[PDB]
Design a protein around this ligand. Structure first.
Ligand SMILES: Nc1ncnc2c1ncn2[C@@H]1O[C@H](COP(=O)(O)OP(=O)(O)OP(=O)(O)O)[C@@H](O)[C@H]1O
Ligand SMILES: [Mg+2]
Lengths: 519, 52
């Protein structure tokens, strides 16, 4: 029921998940029983006990065949589309009928048959734990939620996620894209200022990386382009550390076996490599040790951030090419970008933020902890945006939310070129930015001539052009010509442009009046 | 409302129009494009409120 919902925001990723709500119109991410706000998307069974999050992640070494992980993208997919690469070190996804299933021992008896569970059943059991942790912290039973999803989630996947949540007694109010949630996490803050920006969201995750280019006008977001990558990500960063310390192990212990060839040894290396990686985001030096790595041999070593950034340079340049690809895919140039929001756990790496600063001009704001004082934790953005969206629609009826998402509401004409006025001195001033969804209205204050008097307001079209690099405006077709009589010396002339759904342009130029309409 | 430190053109001598306005051009369907918004944020809900 709309009046009695207990809503939260949920981020549901392949590697980690997070839950959030709003207190006094501010999003706050909830920690679960383990104290984790980034809760591993892992399920594991030992002696009939169900474990999730970090406790389940710890069983990846001792209990791999009864642990299920990296299953978020498997939901709602045919088996022929499943990539089992990241599941190889745990329960394998297999084909049973027209469903993807995992075979695990979730019963208590030692001579009990292992259960065969669909991926939808695994998701349901995991979502019960996530919601269960949110309900325990809130003191109330969580009933509804907004969940973020990638922009290439198929409709079949959307249904499976909603059906899985329903089986967990959780009502899904709305599914929103992961990039739009990251933008909302910033825009919905009290100190935020709404203004026209071209925004690049760099979501650097564990098993995937997604970069999205959005046009943000009038507090509303339109996705211009998106790129996906499954090669450059945090797991690839774990690998450069795994390879680095294993070669040190083999040099320190000649004749010993390679720990990457033993599945138990490799599992220990993954947990420690990720832990060393995160420490290099908080400090310039991090330790790496595994008690009894292989053949009873211990190993302990160190690495500084400088050495890490050198051996991981190939992965870092993969992140750069991803961002350049998305900007190019939108027909834009780095000079066209206003904000770069860095999202996902891997976006905590200080060097990646410094690299993006070199890609974009200094006028571009890099929203990362090490490059901006007002930045948020990159791992909390998606959960914060989902909680902010959930609090906005928690009183809506289910019918109202569905209609608000139909094509008749979301689709509307976007003005291709800019609409502005010509400035002359003895230059094009943009008023309506390019790719502005209509209806829209903007207003600028310009300087009057040296003494003023009669002044010409010439409304024209505008386009951006890059000159070798520098971004300039190019004046195109002329739209209207208006006049303001007897303007004061040193006064400012206010020029307003209004575009309707009809594409009609209404022009106003009153100094603090003349009005005109272009059908 | 954005303040810009740029001067407007002085009106040439002998220029006039009905109510000091002259319509020269207009927007075309070629000059626009149908794009899809993200159904997120209070400003979208306000837009969806007006459309319904
Ligand atoms: N402080 C940190 N510094 C560097 N990397 C980190 C940090 N914290 C987390 N990570 C990395 O971020 C990755 C997980 O990021 P995130 O939680 O956004 O992924 P996800 O979306 O849950 O998973 P996937 O990307 O597979 O869907 C992991 O590889 C982890 O090692
Ligand atoms: Mg993610």
């Amino acid at each position: 029921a709309p009046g009695e919902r207990v809503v939260i925001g949920i981020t549901f990723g392949n590697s980690n998940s997070s839950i959030a709500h709003t207190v006094d119109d501010k999003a706050e991410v909830i920690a679960n029983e383990d104290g984790d706000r980034q809760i591993p998307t892992i399920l594991s069974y030992v002696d009939g006990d169900e474990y999730y999050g970090q406790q389940a992640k710890n069983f990846l070494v001792r209990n791999p065949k009864n642990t299920v992980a990296y299953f978020r993208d498997i939901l709602g997919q045919d088996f022929k589309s499943v990539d089992p690469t990241h599941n190889h070190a745990s329960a394998h996804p297999q084909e049973a009928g027209d469903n993807v299933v995992f075979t695990i021992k979730d019963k208590a008896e030692e001579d009990a048959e292992p259960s065969t569970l669909t991926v939808s059943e695994i998701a349901t059991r995991y979502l019960r734990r996530l919601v269960g942790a949110a309900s325990e912290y809130l003191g109330k039973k969580v009933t509804s939620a907004v969940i973020t999803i990638p922009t290439n989630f198929t409709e079949k996947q959307k249904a499976a996620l909603i059906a899985a949540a329903a089986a967990a007694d959780l009502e899904v109010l709305q599914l929103i894209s992961e990039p739009a949630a990251a933008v909302l996490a910033y825009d919905a803050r009290p100190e935020a200022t709404i203004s026209d920006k071209i925004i690049v969201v760099a979501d650097l995750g564990g098993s995937r990386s997604d970069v999205t280019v959005l046009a943000s006008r009038s507090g509303m977001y339109t996705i211009l382009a998106t790129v996906h990558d499954y090669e450059y990500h945090g797991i690839a960063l774990d690998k450069v550390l795994i390879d680095h310390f294993s070669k040190e192990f083999l040099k320190k212990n000649p004749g010993a076996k390679d720990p990457r060839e033993n599945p138990r040894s490799l599992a220990k290396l993954r947990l420690e490599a990720e832990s060393t990686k995160r420490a290099l985001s908080r400090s310039t030096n991090a330790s790496f040790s595994v008690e009894s790595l292989i053949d009873g041999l211990d190993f302990a070593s160190t690495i500084n951030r400088l050495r890490y950034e050198t051996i991981a340079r190939t992965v870092f340049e993969g992140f750069n090419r991803l961002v350049e690809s998305a900007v190019k895919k939108a027909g834009l140039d780095p000079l066209d970008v206003d904000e770069v929001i860095m999202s996902g756990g891997t976006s905590n790496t200080p060097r990646i933020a410094a690299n993006f600063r070199y890609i974009f001009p200094e006028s571009t704001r890099i929203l990362a902890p090490s490059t901006d004082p007002s930045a948020l934790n990159p791992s909390e953005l998606q959960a914060r945006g989902a909680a902010l969206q959930a609090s906005l629609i928690q009183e809506f009826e289910t019918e109202d939310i569905e209609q608000s998402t139909h094509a008749a509401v979301t689709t509307m004409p976007h003005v291709t070129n800019a609409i502005g006025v010509v400035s002359v001195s003895e230059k094009f001033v943009p008023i309506i930015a390019p790719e502005t969804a209509v209806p829209a209205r903007r207003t600028v204050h310009l300087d009057a001539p040296k003494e003023g008097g009669d002044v010409l307001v010439k409304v024209v079209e505008g386009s951006t052009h890059i000159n070798v690099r520098e971004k300039v405006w190019k004046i195109g077709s002329t739209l209207a010509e208006a006049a303001v009589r007897g303007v004061k010396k040193g006064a400012k002339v206010e020029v307003t442009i209004n575009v309707n759904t009809d594409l009609t342009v209404i022009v106003t130029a009153r100094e603090v009046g003349v009005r005109g309409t272009l059908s | 409302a954005t303040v810009v430190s740029l001067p407007l053109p002085t009106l040439p001598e002998g220029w006039a129009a009905e109510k000091d306005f002259k319509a020269i051009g207009k927007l075309t369907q070629e000059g626009s494009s149908m794009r899809t918004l993200e159904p997120v944020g209070p400003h979208f809900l306000a837009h969806a409120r007006r459309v319904r």
